[PDB]
Write a protein that binds this ligand. Structure first.
Ligand code: FES
Ligand code: FES
Ligand code: FES
Ligand SMILES: [Fe+2]
Ligand SMILES: [Fe+2]
Ligand SMILES: [Fe+2]
Lengths: 433, 180, 433, 180, 433, 180
């Protein structure tokens, strides 16, 4: 029994207080499934995961198991992986290509679209099949990326994404052919609330540029080169969305941390090259110098995060207030050279896999935070999110949006604000931009 | 990855003992956190491979493992491995400081010769018990497919190639900061 | 909290809809322990499990552990397996013979009657010994089968079973010598709601005739046969109890399964011969052609489920909304030859144990259903229990009571309604049999 | 089933290696879903048996295991085993389609010669690790008591009897879709 | 959402009845972290765990992780092991010596005082360093034992202990040097409520006098003699704290049990000789036969439990209503012979470690009780707490306070009465000692 | 406790086998509750040790294990071990009545000869699977550093000294009623 008055008293973007009960309390999460994950746009993957007709990918929308499957008409339809007779999972494999779908319990047959087509012994034992198939979701695509939403009256992806759109095209729209996904989907389980993961890739450069990834950068630099040249970055800019809570952070000018993460060959394709300068003309009108963007993180609300400079994509599946699954793949430009695509594959394994020199440290951080939140006095006093307060201009002469300093938490205060709105406001009549 | 093609005639007792004992010593170095010493066993042309493993219908049974052109848990070489060594031995490597308490139980060692002298195709099953911090316990089971060469070191051998086939689709643990 | 109005809305046998929260909700399960398990008749075993004096068997009633123990005057007393001093388990082993029961924590001694008879250092402490013995359950035996109820205000076993008794007699009273339990009690754990299990043995022959057990029949049929033959049962009937939610389904004149599942020796014994003539003679007042019924299932609400023809019996012990314990054992007619009893032993191990060729698939299905019900949008829409809706008539001139077609969710609706009644009506006159 | 009555003089080194290697191979077949290849190892007179185990006081400890008249988790001769093999390879066998990912780690192998030539009573311990679908993990432990014969086949031996003693009373797994 | 009236119904000390739901209820547990652990005096260890400047020990207050650290001025400060920025564990290792505490996530530097000393880019973003450090607890010592509280409105440690002090001094105050702790903290997990553990050491001599430890006594007695010839003591007393719900029990003159637990050489030290005599001179103000005190158990409410004569000390950290962590160490006189110190080490390991011959039977019982409490009817009837009811007096010539018979539930009633008083009464003004 | 300093030259095949077979047998006695017979394997000068294991930074890595002046899970001599055997076989010993279901999987056996003949230093890994009552499962893993004397008896050796380094800090089990 959480009322709007009480929910509003958990997040204060004006001061910078965060009530810890949001990561722990069972009831707030059970409301999150309804109020957030039941009506937000969620990343299901990339178009190239389902290139041909019949191709499918068993993924998740919050805790709802969902089937993303390409159609005859080159469109993508998404539905609940639940047979509506007695709840049985219809598509039972991670990914593949089927002509149809059949329940293994009583044998209800479905076509590729999720339409119910045959129920065994129908004229003998029976009702209308037309309104008894799995619940379809809204399906939208933003140049490769496939998103889905349950709510019929929620804004279309384009609107929901808002003023952040150009920032997404940094990783996505770089060529006429677009990007493609490398095969394989990395899946592992971290015992912590999803909000830590979303917030990190939103505004948390402050962890990478201090202590969390001191060993991560130690792995990248040459055996001779210790933490002396690795030059520790200092400059960078942080974006906050006008509406949505979407955020992004990137280092500016200083190419220190990127050379360690992705190596020499990748950085040439990103900073100084035929394709690197192509983006500065394809996205020149977006008011952004892409050649200066070196090392970047970005979170799309609620559970979408991606590092444009390293091309890592991940979806944080919530698994109770105390746990999350982590699904991740990587993207590459469809027409890029093979040896740039190979260095993208190897390094994204090296740094950002389950056993990656970077992700190892993030998990162990989040493991301890969640564990501490079992105690009473650990949920008594508010967390500090006052970093960079009153230091974001809405008209920065280098990047569009609410921009300030890189080690700030305005993008973080934005994420918790939209969250607070989506939890306290029941109707889209008030919530829409 | 199919059933390991074992030789009709099993490897000699002396040989079977040497390679078993090698793996036992190998497990000793890792379980007692002697990393710099374990790394010396890896040859220049090392390939440390742990592919992803997905749920497939029998019909798509061949499409279970991620190929050499897809993402994986591990796909490392001599350089990248030394990076991980410099991370694990570091005071600022939080994921392993406080360090873990791992245990490599090694069995099912099957030995097979090749065309190249003093080079062997070794198959072995394992269970890895990782105990972390206060309460954290992660159990791994998979198999190792190695290419080992005879070397002039304390253990008798060196590792040329290694493939780990973990019996896991979704990794239940939060990380893989350990070595297999 | 769940008001009577809210609980009544969960099940609607009118439209044939089930609100998926019933299988997953934590608050309902706790009321289930009170309203359903804390006042229903519950199977605990067979008389031959505890044949001689002092013979005991530690079993469960819901999540309350209990002791079923034979008395000197040949009665079977059932009491709470809990000491009333500090809640320690009195009987700490699975089964055997006891001269007396003694508590391990503070040495309080008990007679086989359950009564507290010895408290050490009593005079330097005190209260009456007669008052402070563990809670006593009502005991009722239907030819070997031992049931238990906690409620003194609950109906007697006969009125509880009602017009369902004849279908229990098919399995039990075939001979004047009665039946005997084959030694061994099988126990394994399935992560799913007990209602899935309770419904399937009540109504669901549909799953056997369709997809679930295609591979199970394949394991039984001759190596000179494939699933196209196997002689596939088509028609049949389904029983719904007048009261108590006791359902049963059986095939008639289609031996295919009864052969494949149980072998030729059992099939001939069940349908033909002087041994089966006695069965049709003793049970010849009900009007049923029991020698023609080829494979039958039955559930006695709530958790007593058995398969007459195969003689497979099981009690589902509940372990939260997300988990059940399955305890399975088998009966034989005490006056049966050496061979038939061996076939009954062997064929139930092959088919319906934890590694049985039938049992494996049921578990695989149920595991996946409960996993999907963790989702939010997976509990928002109702399931479809409409099969055989408005088809069952009481005027069937072969089987007494409400009888429809073999593939119907008629008994299902009877089971779910009775559950909803028990959950909403606190008194037993309002819950009139 | 008391302590295995091992022979005073231990089995020869060659014989030890042979039977150990047999088990390793047999584990590879089962871990890679070669059920047809695995079934061929079973003789006509095979008795595949996994008894029930209960909780008893030391007063009545001999009642722990289920007898011949009693029920069991497995009591299989040749034809019923054959029935199970057709099921596990079958497309409509849901329990193992998609298939599980298992690991049969074998050790503690003790070999006993018998009156019949080319025949041995064999004791061995195991831990079976089963990973299924997304996150399911079932860990089994126990011992195997086999009667083994020398065979024309590729593994060296054939099985005449197998008794699986499982260290569990109530089964914690939802099924026994695997072979021990 | 419990009312004080309902909470008072859980414990009735007059009739001597306990509603079992106190050990099982989730709702009650959560209030306990607030109403009990968030204001009770909680043991963190000993001075000798942190002898030098900078030395630290990571331990627990309820489910709150804390850092007991020795200061430059020979004082000890205790702060929440949660970082105030975003919740990371500040001190990651069990014990050691620190010069400064860096936080691993964003690098928030702390000194050994718990104060926030340095923040990376503090001058950039900006809030002051003073009040933004880990929550400090009040730190008070009782002749070696370090206790810790959260709230300033709670009584001082000395008054909080009250009339229980004389019985702590039997173990503690024996020499003008203080008792030192033996290195090593034993730690293990028991799936049960803390109240069973706290109560047992408070009042329950009964269990050790009866069945629980029959085999444990059998291990320490000479290999020739068995239980029959041995010696089963009966003579002893029981103390109940005026305020606090503390309690203690002891045997009078009988060495049998103490000789079985601690051996010959230790019994000597506690009953006869210069060190034993000096104890009967220092405890002169109490007026107790402290050398006739052979074998003793004591609980300092809520979770501090020790056994004086055998010098075994343990803390019960709660982990939900269905789990505790047991953290145990051992104490000895600093100026005692090395032979006695080894003996005290040897026999404490033998009896009270995770594999100790006493501790084994303790765990076996508690596990079962909590298991039982999963059931509905297992909580329907109250537990018996009527032992010794109305036999206690305040005029005992040997031992001061509320002294009754050794096998009584007077201290237990006192413990559960005090618990009920703290849960209900929110204000210390009525709660005052 | 550093990495087990193994001999450069590995042990002989006969000896390596005998010591392995000794443990496999030892396990059988323990896993079939033949405690008195298992006790008969311990010498009068037995040192049965299992230190506490703490979480430490790499800087303080040498204070990971508890010393001789500190507490332990097990620190036993002959008479103390006999007392435990007297308890474990007794009916009034409730922790093991009903008895648990245990499995000692032994592997990674590394042999070292000493100054004294017939006496050996033995390194070995183990996984102990304990199942208790209805649903209680504790899984332990660690190494055993033994000292074995040759003995003229059914098992071939006798235990002089034993140190169990267990891969845990906080024990997840409620007790240690079993033997290692
Ligand atoms: S649940 Fe899909 S058909 Fe029965
Ligand atoms: S609990 Fe049975 S006597 Fe104390
Ligand atoms: S939480 Fe300590 S600085 Fe981020
Ligand atoms: Fe990071
Ligand atoms: Fe079925
Ligand atoms: Fe005790």
């Amino acid at each position: 029994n959480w009322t709007p008055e009480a929910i509003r008293g958990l997040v204060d973007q004006e001061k910078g207080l965060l009530d810890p009960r949001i990561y722990a309390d069972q009831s707030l999460y059970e409301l999150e499934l309804e109020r957030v994950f039941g009506r937000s746009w969620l990343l299901l993957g990339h178009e190239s995961h389902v290139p041909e007709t019949g191709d499918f990918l068993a993924t998740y929308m919050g805790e709802d198991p969902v089937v993303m499957v390409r159609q005859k008409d080159k469109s993508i339809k998404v539905f609940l992986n639940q047979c509506r007779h007695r709840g049985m999972r219809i598509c039972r494999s991670d990914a593949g290509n089927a002509k149809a779908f059949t329940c293994s319990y009583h044998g209800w047959a479905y076509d590729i679209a999720g339409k119910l087509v045959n129920v065994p012994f129908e004229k003998e034992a029976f009702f209308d099949k037309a309104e008894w198939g799995p619940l379809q979701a809204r399906v939208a695509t933003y140049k490769g990326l496939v998103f889905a939403n349950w709510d019929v009256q929620a804004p279309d992806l384009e609107t929901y994404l808002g003023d952040a759109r150009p920032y997404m095209d940094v990783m996505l729209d770089r060529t006429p052919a677009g990007t493609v996904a490398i095969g394989g989907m990395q899946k592992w389980v971290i015992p912590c609330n999803w909000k830590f993961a979303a917030e990190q890739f939103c505004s948390d450069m402050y962890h990478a540029g201090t202590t969390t990834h001191l060993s991560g950068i130690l792995a990248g630099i040459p055996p001779e080169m210790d933490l002396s040249q690795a030059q520790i970055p200092t400059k960078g800019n942080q974006f906050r969305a006008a509406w949505g809570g979407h955020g992004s952070g990137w280092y500016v000018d200083e190419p220190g941390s990127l050379l360690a993460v992705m190596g020499p060959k990748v950085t040439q394709y990103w900073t100084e090259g035929p394709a690197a300068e192509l983006a500065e003309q394809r996205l020149g009108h977006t008011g952004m110098p892409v050649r200066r963007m070196v090392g970047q993180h970005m979170t799309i609300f609620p559970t979408c995060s991606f590092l444009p400079a390293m091309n890592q994509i991940r979806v944080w599946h919530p698994r109770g207030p105390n746990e999350i699954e982590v699904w991740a793949f990587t993207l590459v430009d469809a027409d890029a050279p093979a040896e740039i695509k190979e260095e993208y594959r190897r390094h994204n394994i090296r740094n950002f896999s389950a056993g990656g020199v970077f992700e190892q440290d993030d998990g162990e951080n989040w493991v301890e935070i969640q564990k501490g939140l079992r105690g009473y006095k650990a949920k008594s006093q508010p967390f500090n999110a006052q970093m960079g307060l009153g230091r974001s201009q809405t008209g920065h002469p280098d990047f569009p949006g609410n921009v300030g300093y890189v080690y700030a938490e305005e993008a973080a205060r934005g994420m918790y604000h939209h969250w607070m709105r989506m939890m306290s406001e029941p109707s889209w009549a008030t919530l829409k931009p | 990855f199919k059933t390991f093609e074992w030789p009709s005639k099993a490897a000699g007792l002396e040989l079977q003992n040497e390679i078993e004992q090698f793996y036992y010593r190998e497990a000793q170095l890792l379980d007692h956190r002697a990393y710099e010493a374990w790394f010396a066993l890896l040859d220049k042309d090392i390939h440390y491979f742990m592919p992803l493993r997905t749920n497939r219908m029998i019909r798509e049974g061949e499409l279970e493992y991620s190929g050499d052109q897809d993402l994986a848990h591990f796909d490392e070489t001599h350089e990248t491995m030394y990076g991980r060594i410099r991370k694990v031995t570091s005071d600022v490597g939080w994921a392993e400081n406080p360090p873990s308490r791992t245990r490599h139980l090694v069995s099912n060692v099957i030995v097979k010769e090749t065309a190249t002298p003093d080079t062997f195709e070794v198959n072995s099953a394992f269970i890895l018990y990782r105990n972390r911090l206060e309460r954290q316990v992660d159990i791994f089971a998979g198999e190792r497919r190695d290419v080992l060469r005879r070397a002039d070191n304390n253990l008798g051998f060196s590792i040329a190639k290694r493939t780990i086939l973990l019996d896991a689709s979704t990794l239940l643990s939060n990380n893989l900061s350990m070595f297999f």
